[PDB]
Design a protein around this nucleic acid. Structure first.
Lengths: 54, 292, 255
RNA sequence: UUUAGAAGGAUUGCCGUCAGGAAAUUAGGUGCGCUUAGCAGUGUACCGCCGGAGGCGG
């Protein structure tokens, strides 16, 4: 393949993201919810295992 | 100890370039005046009657070379890479390569077609809040490399120190003034159509892609096998290739794949020119993996 | 003085005989070997020395003349009888005997041995095959007559080969029980007719077709066979039918 | 030198009438897509010109 295709162009599609010419800083906003740990057990087919975990 | 390259190996860039934006200007009142330059609907772009100067503004970010590996699936190869890099920073502090990169800025190679047929070209380089003394641009050949210019040395020292690791970042901002004359064509970069020449617009005005400028700065390879015959710098590539004239200048044992699987898999001490080329490929970046 | 292989490719035969007193289906192998011998005898009267010493039978499609009922069984069809010589030849309706007819597309691999085996031999076979029959059927068209060298120049199809080992190693108490048991175990085998066995001695009787030859009264003998593809085959020699003659037995075998 | 050699299956036709599928429900827990790049190739060829069709100038 190197003999027959070492010089052959390669168009490719892509996407990019840059800032403007008048700005120099990035701002990121997000949020977190915190919940209790004992009230986070969704399914258990044996009650004794649940009591042991608790 | 080591038998092959890992199944996932990648390097990031250490020379990040912003996109360029075009302006119109007059020469004698250049530092008090600036106007936009737009593309006139093929598509073509030509300077106004009242102006005779193109202005190019772009910037470069310089990052360290050790902290530029994104993935490696084998810790031993990572330790080998870091040992070879510290052996390079023992001998030469990334200084010859950096001098060549500042030389490509000074030569004004980034003006691809816009360099022929100009009468005054000036380039000023800004780092931090200090503006360094300007450049003449038409006193530097496109086939040599000056090594005795003081301002080039002062920029190249900081670029070399930032790649070494003694500094964590450097931001370089460059402005260029090209006097072509009134009503002349400016020739900006052309987009990819997956008919007609469709040009590239950035923030309403015209400009060049960052890839085209980065191709200009990487023409620093003068260590290829057949250098004495054709004596012209080639841009840095793996299977070393020049789209200018149709010839693979590195098909075989001087390519990057063998030269890196002859330094880390078989711990042989290579010549300094091949080490220069391998480090230049690592300041370029790419995916270097191996099936199985 | 030379040996080669000639292929007769994709021949259409219409209305070939399909009844051998216990079998309705594929015609007997002696008809195909007699077609090969008749082609040999017609080529040697045009002063072209050749000898066919082996034939391979390849199958591509078939159609039995009749229909299939709702229960999955075949019902055969026969043409309306015409005038038949005898004591009731001047009557309007004649008798209906036992008959069956089949339609085939097949290909033949011939092993020829002569002084010259070029493509002029192929042209002579092309000129001599429009005056012959296969079983009792007519040839409508053929595709191409050509020389072959290896197993990869053969078109796709399914060949017929002898499976006498699967009949001698089965059940017991008589040969017909072995036949029925061997047909119940592996379902991809067929009964075929493979020649003749004597029922008298050799001599001269009155009423022969040629009154200058030897004569014997015979009975047909039957064996087992199977189908193998043309891309799973080992050698050319393992699919070629040949003649063999003992004292009292007239057979067709794959050595 | 082929279980050889031979063959007209034909004509005609009214499938019809009626009808309740119906009731109940818990899909749920977890998670890094991602390292590289010059839209080039030359980006396309204009007016004529005699001739009458066929051939050079800028």
């Amino acid at each position: 393949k190197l003999e027959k295709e070492i010089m052959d162009p390669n168009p490719q599609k892509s996407q990019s993201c840059t800032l403007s010419t008048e700005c120099d800083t990035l701002r990121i906003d997000f949020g977190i919810k915190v919940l209790p740990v004992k009230e986070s057990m969704y399914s258990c087919s044996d009650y004794n295992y649940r009591t042991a975990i608790y | 100890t080591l038998k092959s390259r890992p199944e996932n190996l990648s390097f990031a860039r250490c020379l990040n370039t912003t996109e360029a934006k075009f302006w119109q200007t007059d020469f004698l009142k250049r530092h008090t005046f600036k106007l936009p330059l737009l593309i006139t609907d093929s598509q073509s772009c030509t300077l106004s009657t009242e102006c005779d100067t193109l202005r190019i503004d772009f910037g470069i970010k310089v990052l360290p070379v050790k902290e530029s590996m994104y993935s490696c699936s084998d810790y031993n190869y990572r330790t080998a890479i870091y040992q070879k890099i510290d052996e390079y920073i023992a001998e030469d502090g990334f200084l010859t390569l950096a001098k060549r990169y500042v030389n490509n800025i000074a030569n004004a190679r980034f003006l691809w077609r816009n360099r022929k047929g100009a009468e005054i070209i000036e380039t000023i380089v800004t780092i931090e809040d200090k503006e360094y003394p300007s450049f003449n641009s038409k006193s530097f050949n496109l086939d040599t490399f000056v090594e005795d210019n003081a301002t080039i040395n002062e920029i190249a020292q900081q670029i070399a120190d930032t790649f070494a690791g003694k500094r964590e970042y450097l931001n370089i901002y460059v402005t260029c003034f090209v006097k072509i004359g009134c009503a002349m064509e400016v020739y900006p970069s052309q987009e990819m159509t997956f008919k007609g020449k469709k040009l590239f617009k950035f923030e309403g005005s015209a400009g060049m892609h960052s890839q085209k400028i980065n191709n200009a700065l990487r023409t620093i390879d003068t260590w290829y096998p057949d250098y004495t015959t054709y004596e012209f710098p080639i841009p840095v590539e793996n299977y070393g290739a020049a789209r200018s004239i149709g010839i693979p200048f590195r098909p075989d044992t001087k390519s990057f794949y063998k030269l890196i699987d002859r330094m880390i898999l078989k711990n042989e001490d290579l010549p300094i020119e091949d080490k220069h080329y391998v480090m230049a490929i690592l300041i370029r970046g790419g995916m270097f993996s191996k099936k199985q | 003085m030379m040996k080669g292989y000639i292929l007769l490719e994709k021949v259409n035969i219409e209305n070939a005989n399909a009844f051998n007193n216990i079998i309705v289906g594929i015609p007997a192998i002696t008809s195909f070997l007699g077609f090969a011998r008749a082609l040999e005898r017609k080529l040697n009267a045009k002063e072209i020395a050749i000898r066919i010493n082996g034939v391979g039978l390849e199958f591509h499609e078939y159609e039995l003349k009749g229909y299939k009922n709702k229960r999955g069984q075949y019902v055969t069809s026969c043409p309306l009888p015409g005038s038949i010589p005898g004591q009731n030849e001047k009557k309007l309706d004649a008798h209906i005997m036992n008959q069956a007819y089949i339609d085939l597309n097949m290909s033949f691999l011939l092993e020829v041995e002569g002084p010259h085996v070029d493509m002029s031999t192929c042209k002579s076979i092309k000129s001599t095959m429009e005056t012959l029959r296969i079983a009792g059927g007519i040839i409508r068209n053929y595709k191409k007559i050509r020389l072959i060298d290896t197993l990869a120049d053969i078109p796709y199809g399914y060949f017929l080969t002898l499976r006498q080992d699967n009949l001698n190693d089965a059940a017991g108490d008589d040969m017909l029980d072995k036949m029925i048991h061997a047909l119940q175990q592996e379902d991809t085998l067929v009964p075929i007719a493979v020649g003749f066995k004597a029922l008298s001695e050799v001599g001269h009787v009155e009423g022969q077709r040629d009154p200058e030859k030897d004569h014997c009264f015979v009975e047909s003998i039957f064996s087992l066979g199977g189908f193998e593809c043309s891309k799973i085959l080992e050698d050319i020699n393992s699919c070629l039918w040949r003649y063999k003659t003992e004292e009292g037995l007239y057979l067709c075998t794959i050595i």
